[PDB]
Design a protein around this ligand. Structure first.
Ligand SMILES: Cc1cc2c(cc1C)N(C[C@H](O)[C@H](O)[C@@H](O)COP(=O)(O)O)C1=NC(=O)NC(=O)[C@]1(O/C(C(=O)O)=C(/O)C(=O)O)N2
Ligand SMILES: Cc1cc2c(cc1C)N(C[C@H](O)[C@H](O)[C@@H](O)COP(=O)(O)O)C1=NC(=O)NC(=O)[C@]1(O/C(C(=O)O)=C(/O)C(=O)O)N2
Ligand SMILES: Cc1cc2c(cc1C)N(C[C@H](O)[C@H](O)[C@@H](O)COP(=O)(O)O)C1=NC(=O)NC(=O)[C@]1(O/C(C(=O)O)=C(/O)C(=O)O)N2
Ligand SMILES: Cc1cc2c(cc1C)N(C[C@H](O)[C@H](O)[C@@H](O)COP(=O)(O)O)C1=NC(=O)NC(=O)[C@]1(O/C(C(=O)O)=C(/O)C(=O)O)N2
Lengths: 330, 330, 330, 330
């Protein structure tokens, strides 16, 4: 799987960049808990069903995706490889997986979107509502299909790895969308009224926040502790997903991320009730280790592992994988 | 117990063969979980009962067995020792334990069955229904007493040990029954209508699959994650057994396997409600380390450990061992 | 506490004797679980009560004891020190703690009892009922106050340490009461009708066995997996004690043993509802390391630790310690 | 965070003093459990609330504090640094955090209180009720705002580190308030009738003790196992807090301590329902490593971490942090 890639990335990247990537907030309690949560989940597979036409495809936000997965927004991809966002966006397009353009992309969102595929745009709320809504309109004018409003960063968590490294953006990595402020529910309304694209709230962990996101007109949420990078001691998304799925009752798409490292982890997420996962760090290890061709290989291996895991679980379709039962281990 | 044998086998076998044997799918989460599940189970022994006539015998599929245990189907036994299946089948016969002939046996099922004893036949479903049913008829014509239909291998799991070893069958190990396709419930019907032998579905983990197996006319099931070799993250059988036993309500025999390493583990399986266990890897460690006499010694040591464990638990009979209570530890 | 003593004993004893002492059955799952069970138990202390007259004394089987504790029966004490049972019995008497004379004592039970104090006698059932009942009468004629009928040894568990050591009784260690058979409930009746002493069944783990022991006229039970020396995978006593206490409802004394290593462990046992503990291995480490004076020092340190733990928990009396609540940790 | 400081303190202090500070009673089961309890607690953060005016302030015992935190009473602060209590009290005052003057302060309580700020006084009950009540009156005459009656030390726990070190007060460290006896509920009444200051019972772990403390006229309790220094095997405070909070139903302030090492730990304590925490050992590591300026820096870092954690959890106020939900991990 992806475990060699992690090493290959540790080798090629300067320590302080691999730390920017790998790290969480505080004591990294939430970073590690993301993995322990997935490792505790056991799937109950079903046997003897028709697998003649096993398909990993889903429809999400009006469109077909090849797998129940999107590339998570990860800022400043030129930190990992000279072609940064463009290499990832190309591989994503060719794998039929959505790609989430960041607000802090090291290439302009217009350029990334011209790559084609299914680009989404991740929004950080700026101090000026008009700058925020102009970023939303640019993304929509540029053909982005969803606004992934990041709602768990009223400010960045305390990253002790980057504080200890005195890490700072190299001169040659820029925020290309530019020549910030806590978001609120009113900020969500402002975006929702400005766009006809689906608004996807990223970083929901409370059941009542899931519910309110539906009330608020979200088309989706991402059940996420931000890869353990925001509140240290935040519950993992994976530990809140089943509850959140039951409370939303079909009222928006429910994605999850944090620690997805395999196809089997995708199967577990789907059996908990997720519509799709986001994968972050692994796509940046592939990017670091081998640029566009590395990301394309990661996405093919993940595509094979999802298909393998589904069929061994008796699931012809992602919808069947959602109906699987689970059992929690120790 | 068997722990020396494991070492003795590691010594004598080429690394890549010991890996074929020892390995599971994916990250081996289900391989390890099989052991953690049994280690969590504590038996509540009963005291002061009559042990004058302690007997480990059971009746299963019309016939007496000496212990609540059969040899699991393990392909290509000539990988482990020159006499392969014949050495194991001889030791099994002389120990009064059923032996499961594989579809991928490295000696023909007719030869293995001529050894006598209580041979069962494990069926992999082939692409051609007529080849499948002809393998069933051969087994029945050859005096096999049960068809162990393996229902958890629509295709083989991803074995990272064998992928990393680029492992492949030596020239001198053949599939002797030959000069494959996902099974379904219709495949089960096809076998059930073709034979009067008991059909035993191997690889059931879902309660509703157990129930349906009874509905379908199975004479037995094996509650099994295939030794952690199929879906990585599949629940252990041992973790589903009690639920499955309660749902079947006596309607077929319920075997379990995965990680049985002692007589006490046999006692635990029986106290959870299993009719019998299958033992896989340990019979191949004995075979590797000492051929027929090694398997016979393993089966005598297991026979002594089962009898010891039963009497220390106050059980004169396997039926009394099924009535024991358990308590789950950490 | 006792942890230095363990080392001091490892130093002075031949490896194979320290193994006779330290060891359990099978994989020692039940030996280790005894410790993990006590370590999981947290006491909820009470504050601000009157401690003016804190007393560790109890009345058990008609008589006062200085602490809620007795010395467990441990065979062949001359293995650990030349004065063997006599050194332990002297220290026990002078500490006001009952001492359990073994059926396999390396000094005659008449000699051990002449030491005075509060000797109990542990009975193994022999093949001949008349030899058994004659051992009971000797103990009673010798002034023993209780018969501790060991009911968890229809035969000795498989001790892999002693099998691997080919351990056997030295020539100079004898069974002094001599110049065996599974006990049953009828054996219990036979003893109960032969003596007016309290009969204490040692090795009860099932709730229904506790209840039946009361029905049968037992004056006590010892909730015990025999220090993990009998069924490997037997639940720890400490894990069944609260349930057993509730089911007996005051109908006999309920002792527990296995892994008691401190006064705080005595407090935990009492807060679970035990009347008293037995301590085995620690009394033999003291004996090995320093003979009679070593056992007397162990008993004084345990006496101080029990008194300390009780007062820090707000308990003036052992009866108050039984009313404490507990909380189970991980 | 504080983890470097711990090392810096280990370096500068004599082993036997760092052990006086770091150590618990018995096997330190309760010392370690304090940390495992906090590490098991996950917060469920809320998103998208107004953080325009995030404030860490609370009102407690009539007065504003800058953070939900006080310095715990820790005896003989001149052990850690020449300025001992005065350095800590100065830093506490300037950080707007209450400081708890000990009965065994190595500077007189009148001197410590002249520093100003929000001094509380911790009371150990003496053999003579009149000495006890005269210490209470001195504290009140000296402008202390609360009496923190320590109710979990009828006598000091067995500190094996200090027994093994034969540790004893250096000649140059004195008990400055001087030129002891178990407290009871009558002792609590005696203090309550002698002072109009709030009486805060420190070392409550039982629900019924919490309730009785309210009945008794306490203004507060501290849910505390005394940093694992008193009963070894005492439940952690953090494990009883939620239950205690629910039982008090607003009837007194409920503080907690034991193992608070960060702002996130403060957030966890508050989400469990605590009014405020006490921090002990970390304030003495800062003191040892850098005297007054070290304590002031610790309090600024803790102040920043609390504010960070609150905002990442969507809490504008400590009252909002109390309403957060939690989820217990493994
Ligand atoms: C290096 C880096 C950068 C980001 C992010 C993650 C990493 C690892 N994230 C979090 C991801 O989208 C995301 O939830 C996953 O990382 C968590 O899952 P995973 O890596 O285990 O698969 C991001 N999530 C977002 O919504 N937006 C990002 O820009 C996003 O937030 C920022 C940022 O812009 O600087 C951070 O610095 C940070 O999150 O710590 N950027
Ligand atoms: C080397 C090897 C080979 C097999 C199998 C196991 C091993 C270890 N199994 C699984 C066993 O029957 C079985 O459930 C036990 O192995 C699991 O228990 P255990 O070894 O812990 O006691 C097999 N179970 C079957 O129903 N049929 C086999 O042929 C069986 O499946 C195949 C195969 O034919 O190639 C596999 O390669 C595989 O399972 O991974 N073969
Ligand atoms: C070396 C030795 C010997 C014995 C026993 C224990 C040890 C350690 N026991 C078990 C104890 O009475 C007892 O329950 C405790 O050992 C378990 O608690 P602990 O040592 O953790 O405090 C014994 N319990 C009994 O009722 N009778 C003994 O003679 C007793 O049983 C025999 C025997 O006679 O040979 C054993 O060999 C054995 O138990 O394994 N003898
Ligand atoms: C070195 C030392 C000394 C004390 C105390 C703690 C330490 C570490 N305490 C316990 C604290 O107030 C307190 O609850 C915290 O230590 C527990 O939390 P933490 O250090 O993990 O943050 C104390 N709590 C009190 O109410 N009074 C103290 O004097 C207090 O009790 C005494 C004493 O006076 O000698 C002790 O020796 C002892 O507690 O073990 N003194």
């Amino acid at each position: 799987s992806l475990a060699d890639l992690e090493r290959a990335a540790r080798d090629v990247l300067p320590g302080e960049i691999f730390d920017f990537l790998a790290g969480g907030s505080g004591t990294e309690a939430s970073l590690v808990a993301n993995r322990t949560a997935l490792e505790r989940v056991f799937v109950i597979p079903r046997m003897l069903r028709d697998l003649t036409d096993v398909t990993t495809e889903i429809d999400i936000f009006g469109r077909r995706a090849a797998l129940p997965m999107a590339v998570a927004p990860v800022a400043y991809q030129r930190l990992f490889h000279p072609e940064g966002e463009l290499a990832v966006a190309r591989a994503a397009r060719d794998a039929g997986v959505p790609y989430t353009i960041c607000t802090l992309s090291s290439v302009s969102l217009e350029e990334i979107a011209a790559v084609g595929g299914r680009p989404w745009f991740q929004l950080f709320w700026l101090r000026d509502e008009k700058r925020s809504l102009d970023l939303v309109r640019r993304a929509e004018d540029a053909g982005c299909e969803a606004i992934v409003f990041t709602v768990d960063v009223p400010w960045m968590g305390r990253r002790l790895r980057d504080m200890r490294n005195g890490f700072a953006l190299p001169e040659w990595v820029t925020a290309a969308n530019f020549d910030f402020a806590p978001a609120t529910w009113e900020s969500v309304e402002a975006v929702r009224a400005h766009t006809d694209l689906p608004v996807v709230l990223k970083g929901i962990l409370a059941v009542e926040d899931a519910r309110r996101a539906v009330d608020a007109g979200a088309g989706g949420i991402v059940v996420s502790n931000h890869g353990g990078r925001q509140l240290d001691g935040a519950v993992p998304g994976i530990e809140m997903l089943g509850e959140i799925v039951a409370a939303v009752s079909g009222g928006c798409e429910v994605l999850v991320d944090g620690g997805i490292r395999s196809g089997g982890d995708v199967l577990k997420a789907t059996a908990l009730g997720a519509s799709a996962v986001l994968v972050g760090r692994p796509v940046m290890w592939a990017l670091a280790a081998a640029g566009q061709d590395g990301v394309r290989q990661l996405l093919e291996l993940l595509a094979e592992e999802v298909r393998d895991a589904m069929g061994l679980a008796g699931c012809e379709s992602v919808g069947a994988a959602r109906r699987l039962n689970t059992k929690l281990g120790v």
